Design an enzyme around this catalytic site. Structure first.
Site, PDB file in Angstrom:
ATOM      1  N   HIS A  68       0.844  -1.220   0.000  1.00 52.97           N
ATOM      2  CA  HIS A  68       0.000   0.000   0.000  1.00 52.97           C
ATOM      3  C   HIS A  68       0.872   1.260   0.000  1.00 52.97           C
ATOM      4  CE1 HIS A  68      -3.191  -2.919   1.296  1.00 52.97           C
ATOM      5  NE2 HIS A  68      -3.794  -2.266   0.317  1.00 52.97           N
ATOM      6  N   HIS A  72       1.729   1.502  -5.817  1.00 54.72           N
ATOM      7  CA  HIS A  72       0.314   1.050  -5.899  1.00 54.72           C
ATOM      8  C   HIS A  72      -0.581   2.207  -6.379  1.00 54.72           C
ATOM      9  CE1 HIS A  72      -3.461  -0.889  -4.897  1.00 54.72           C
ATOM     10  NE2 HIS A  72      -3.740   0.149  -4.112  1.00 54.72           N
ATOM     11  N   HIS A 106      -6.107   7.339  -3.220  1.00 56.37           N
ATOM     12  CA  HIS A 106      -7.107   6.407  -2.641  1.00 56.37           C
ATOM     13  C   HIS A 106      -6.559   5.681  -1.410  1.00 56.37           C
ATOM     14  CE1 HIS A 106      -5.177   2.968  -4.638  1.00 56.37           C
ATOM     15  NE2 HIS A 106      -5.930   2.202  -3.857  1.00 56.37           N
ATOM     16  N   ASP A 107      -5.240   5.539  -1.251  1.00 55.37           N
ATOM     17  CA  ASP A 107      -4.658   4.827  -0.084  1.00 55.37           C
ATOM     18  C   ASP A 107      -3.669   5.730   0.689  1.00 55.37           C
ATOM     19  OD1 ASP A 107      -5.764   2.098   0.218  1.00 55.37           O
ATOM     20  OD2 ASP A 107      -4.612   1.459  -1.515  1.00 55.37           O
ATOM     21  N   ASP A 217      -8.279  -0.877  -8.351  1.00 57.82           N
ATOM     22  CA  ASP A 217      -7.643  -1.259  -7.071  1.00 57.82           C
ATOM     23  C   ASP A 217      -7.137  -2.702  -7.117  1.00 57.82           C
ATOM     24  OD1 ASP A 217      -6.652  -0.548  -4.648  1.00 57.82           O
ATOM     25  OD2 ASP A 217      -8.516  -0.894  -3.535  1.00 57.82           O
ATOM     26  N   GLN A 269      -6.019 -18.081  -3.449  1.00 54.02           N
ATOM     27  CA  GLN A 269      -6.055 -17.277  -4.705  1.00 54.02           C
ATOM     28  C   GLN A 269      -7.236 -17.703  -5.591  1.00 54.02           C
ATOM     29  OE1 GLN A 269      -3.914 -14.556  -5.973  1.00 54.02           O
ATOM     30  NE2 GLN A 269      -3.636 -14.417  -3.771  1.00 54.02           N
TER      31      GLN A 269
END
Ligand SMILES: COc1c(C)cnc(CSc2nc3ccc4cccnc4c3[nH]2)c1C
Ligand SMILES: [Mg+2]
Ligand SMILES: [Zn+2]
Length: 313
Positions: A68, A72, A106-107, A217, A269
């Site tokens: 993060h 990213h 956004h982060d 995202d 996954q």
């Protein structure tokens, strides 16, 4: 005014494709973002002096966490760039301005920990924001940086346009809270099938933008396999550190965050692609057909994870 950004030939070409990787040269990421704003929005959308100063303040407020991080932010903004470019006419001038900035921010100031960890730790942010804790923090930080002297990239918008763009960015950032993705996608699924989906309905546009934010995202699952696989190492490096900190509070983490259950990653996954990734890009492809290469890349990567389980790698 007449100052373009230009990329080398390989980047100029590949940056237009959904599966572009922005590379390991951190010093090129700001220019890559400015390039994308200029082609997506126009060379006049923002004052270059203010935009450059906005970018470098946003970069400074991302931390040195495995996943993060600033890489990213730019990666998520590139995926949004590719969606907007392949859907020229569907988005307003304000939406194109707002959404690239929203993805970059956004982060903001992420610590490498989930909303659940903040709540179980009893972190102050969990008292200030009971739901979508980090996402409300990220928007808060976005407004703070916009209010620094010289950093207001929206200053040449009217009062109502300024309020509309901040409102686009706020919903866009809240929508990256994966807890909210599931309900948002079910609604868009019902609306598309019963035929009630109406892109002139503001509440409907909001829902579609929310899905675009989830798609951007999660976009590590839509890259070429070696990128997807190496990003998964960074994702689990954060998760396993959170699991370590859960154990410090005397709480067994969920298997996803417990480094002692590395062996079960391939199966985890599969569940993630089947429960989240595939449904996300499928519904997005139904609403915005030119985003089909994301769904195709996601299915290729599901197939690669199935081959890991069958011992073929
Ligand atoms: C950020 O979203 C992601 C992306 C892009 C890629 N991968 C992931 C991880 S998906 C995932 N879901 C599960 C469930 C149980 C697990 C047990 C043991 C090990 N890994 C597990 C796992 N990994 C996420 C959450
Ligand atoms: Mg987030
Ligand atoms: Zn993110």
């Amino acid at each position: 005014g007449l100052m373009q950004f230009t990329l080398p030939v390989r980047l100029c070409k590949e940056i237009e494709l959904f599966h572009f990787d922005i590379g390991p040269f951190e010093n090129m990421w700001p220019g890559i973002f400015v390039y994308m704003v200029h082609r997506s929005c126009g060379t006049s959308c923002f004052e270059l002096e203010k935009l450059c100063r906005f970018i470098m303040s946003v970069k400074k407020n991302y931390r040195r966490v495995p996943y993060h991080n600033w890489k990213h932010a730019v990666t998520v903004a590139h995926c949004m760039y590719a969606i907007l470019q392949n859907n020229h006419t569907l988005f307003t001038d304000l939406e194109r301005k707002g959404l690239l900035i929203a993805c970059l921010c956004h982060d903001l100031d992420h610590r490498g920990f989930s909303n659940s960890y903040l709540q179980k730790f009893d972190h102050p942010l969990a008292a200030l924001y009971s739901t979508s804790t980090m996402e409300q923090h990220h928007f808060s930080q976005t407004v703070s940086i916009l209010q620094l002297e010289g950093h207001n990239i929206f200053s040449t918008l009217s009062s109502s346009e300024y309020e509309q763009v901040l409102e686009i960015i706020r919903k866009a950032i809240i929508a990256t809270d994966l807890a909210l993705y599931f309900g948002n996608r079910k609604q868009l699924e019902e609306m598309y099938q019963t035929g009630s989906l109406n892109l002139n309905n503001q509440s409907h546009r909001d829902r579609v933008i929310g899905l675009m934010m989830t798609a951007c995202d999660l976009c590590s699952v839509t890259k070429l396999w070696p990128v997807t696989k190496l990003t998964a190492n960074d994702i689990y490096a954060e998760f396993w550190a959170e699991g370590d900190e859960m154990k410090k509070l005397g709480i067994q983490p969920i298997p996803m965050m417990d480094r002692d259950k590395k062996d079960e990653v391939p199966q985890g996954q599969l569940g993630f692609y089947n429960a989240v990734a595939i449904p996300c890009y499928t519904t997005l492809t139904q609403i915005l057909p030119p985003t089909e290469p994301l769904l195709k890349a996601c299915r290729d990567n599901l197939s690669q994870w199935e081959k890991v389980i069958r011992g073929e790698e």
